[PDB]
Amino acid sequence: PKATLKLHILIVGCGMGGLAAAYCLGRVGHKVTVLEQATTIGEVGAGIQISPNVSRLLDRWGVGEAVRKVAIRPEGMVFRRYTSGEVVGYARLAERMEAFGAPYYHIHRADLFNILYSLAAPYMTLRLGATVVSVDTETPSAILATGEVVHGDLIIGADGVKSFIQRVVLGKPSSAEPTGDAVYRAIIPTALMRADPELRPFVDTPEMTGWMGPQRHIMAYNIRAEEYNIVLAHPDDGGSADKMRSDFADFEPRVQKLLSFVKSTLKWRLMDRQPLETWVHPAGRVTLLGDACHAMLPYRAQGAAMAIEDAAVLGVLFAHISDIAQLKPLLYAYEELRLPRTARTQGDARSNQKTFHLPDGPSQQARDDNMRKAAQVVGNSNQWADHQKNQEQFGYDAEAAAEQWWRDVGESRIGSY
Amino acid sequence: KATLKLHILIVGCGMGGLAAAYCLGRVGHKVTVLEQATTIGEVGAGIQISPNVSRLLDRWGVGEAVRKVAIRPEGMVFRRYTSGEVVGYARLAERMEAFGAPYYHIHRADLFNILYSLAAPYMTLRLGATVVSVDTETPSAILATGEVVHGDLIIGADGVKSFIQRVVLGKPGDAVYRAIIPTALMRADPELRPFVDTPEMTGWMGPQRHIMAYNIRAEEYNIVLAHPDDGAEGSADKMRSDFADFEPRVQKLLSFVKSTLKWRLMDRQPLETWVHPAGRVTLLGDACHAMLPYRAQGAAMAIEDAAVLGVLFAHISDIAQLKPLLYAYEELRLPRTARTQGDARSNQKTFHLPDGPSQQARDDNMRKAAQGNSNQWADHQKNQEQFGYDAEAAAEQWWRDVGESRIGSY
């Protein structure tokens, strides 16, 4: 599976999107340069959830063992009432998720980044301290803040929620905007939890726990043997750990204990964007991936999934390029394959903002009832207990989708050019 | 309360008998229970009590007592025999409380005592009273001593080897080991402690055999091992030998068993009728729908049987209505119990598959919680049908729709 025509591909951004794109495109014969503005690389000190649609790909790419060594395999997702901790919903993870062909893991962002870096490294010329400030959309070329011109055949903006390349693609200022929500992000020692009989079960029976309250919710889960991840969503108004404790003072007693263990916290503002009208610059030499085109509320835990899926689709499509005339149509095929899914996913995250943050009242009572009975789509419910939603999200195979597309459509539409 | 107060003879003081005595007594009928044993009580074993049952116990005012002694399991977990690999999960806990009452694990004796407390003020219990013959016309039950006991109606709650069933009908390969082990021994082993600390119904499935196990009290873990009966206190040695191929955690659990009850399981096709044609004798519980215990609903069906009898017989005002009421009882109960017996049969097959295509397909169905060859308790429809059922509501619905005008015409 190699491309007849080898491109020089410029990837702006060395987050997880960038890494995965460098691996996926490099391994099919393309030359890859990654231009990163920061003078270091790595992920922040926090947990991430990786669903089967992602871990299917990690397994396929030969890093399943590394994932398995560091990551935690939760048994279930448990939703609880803020004041008491009363369980109002369960969605089975574990073998219920493995039925889609790979596990549902909880992992430290740094461990995941390091694993992706191990795949990308031989495929990418990484340039750090390289801030793209302009683009020649015709050639194309990426122009650094120093004035250095970097020539290639194609530019991928994997440059995140403050993407410059999004601005290039749309030909004007354009941004993800604040949502009115922020999170505190914290890791605490599992050792402190194991020492308390009420908190030990949260370590010894790994689950994704969600406490839902008026305008606020907490998600918490083990991410390494020594570390438990906590994320607290709350109204953004503009003693960091102190203000967090204060903001969640009405949550149940076990929550108060967990928060008493937090020494410090990242404050993080949550951005969101309406879906873009296009991911392709009209001249057909620049496109986007990851948060640069589908930044979403994190309440569906699929943003990195979508970035990595985006990369996997690019890899499959661009293994088939044999002529420069096919480049622009391939970018539109990428957009066609990815825009609807990512937009739906952004949508489900927005639905969960509402569901998770309901004030006490009729809606909240109905939500809790739906969650107890695991209501099926055949202030709403537990998406992860819905078999159809699970099939659509977690049963998806990015590589298979793009190959199916090539066979059915791409071959006859692009394949002769 | 009933306009016409009957004298009702109940043969058997197992759980069916007790529930019938309570349900019939409280609506005005006089009740005599004839039990052949000179004591009453239950065997040393666990039972699972589903929402269809615990809804009724709650309604009858013993919910707090039940809650005090019961364990509330989180889930039901099915595992492969060789490895212990989890191949299926069905959520219990709040998933089951969505049907209006909890799914409990409880010691048979604790449940029996609670039923006894309900029935006791309503019944005259006669122990050492073995019914050996019946006058189906009068009717009367005649004891082994020759004493004749008169009443208006006889209910056979006299178990799997019911004599009254033989009266009513007018004509003449699996076993389990049952054990309890101390939770202390499990708590002491880091591999086994989770089974105590996270209460589940665990089922290990293998060729021709399966094990079910669950906590029933603070100190006690219930274990039941189904296996081919080649045809009673059993040998714990033979049990261990029969399950020597099961996963190492199971070997540990069985190494803790000091003794075992050996118990033969009988499965019966549904009866053609539960009413003697003269309309003075009927059946309840294992006396009419003894099933393989693989669906954990035998006592549920007996208690439901009783609850429907109570509702129907609150309405009797004339002796002419008695026979039609027994047929109404049968009409309301026979199809559900037969379906239930059927689900237990289907589980025999599912649980006992040899390794092969079927077993692989079963495991796939169980992982994904297919909505047979799967985990019935993870199926929403089957759950609604079995556990969402309210015996008293069904019978009142029936009264409103049909019974008032149909039994009104006697």
Ligand SMILES: Cc1cc2nc3c(=O)[nH]c(=O)nc-3n(C[C@H](O)[C@H](O)[C@H](O)COP(=O)(O)OP(=O)(O)OC[C@H]3O[C@@H](n4cnc5c(N)ncnc54)[C@H](O)[C@@H]3O)c2cc1C
């Ligand atoms: C609280 C929270 C929880 C989340 N939980 C989950 C979850 O459980 N599961 C999940 O799948 N996703 C999750 N996500 C989403 C996930 O974090 C992101 O979608 C993903 O990390 C985005 O990766 P990316 O590579 O597109 O962007 P980024 O990680 O933003 O990387 C972009 C990179 O581009 C560089 N760059 C920017 N501009 C320039 C420029 N002009 N020149 C050069 N380089 C530039 C940046 O410096 C950065 O290194 C979560 C997000 C949040 C905030």
Ligand SMILES: Cc1cc2nc3c(=O)[nH]c(=O)nc-3n(C[C@H](O)[C@H](O)[C@H](O)COP(=O)(O)OP(=O)(O)OC[C@H]3O[C@@H](n4cnc5c(N)ncnc54)[C@H](O)[C@@H]3O)c2cc1C
């Ligand atoms: C291994 C196993 C596990 C089970 N697990 C479950 C479970 O999880 N959930 C569930 O709901 N059910 C379960 N069951 C089923 C349940 O135990 C039975 O369905 C129920 O106990 C039957 O009650 P009964 O009162 O109809 O009959 P029995 O309990 O058999 O009582 C009949 C009584 O009548 C007496 N008697 C008999 N003949 C006469 C006579 N001629 N005169 C007077 N008295 C007489 C007997 O001595 C006895 O006392 C299980 C059964 C088994 C074997």
Ligand SMILES: [Cl-]
């Ligand atoms: Cl996300």
Ligand SMILES: [Cl-]
């Ligand atoms: Cl049973």
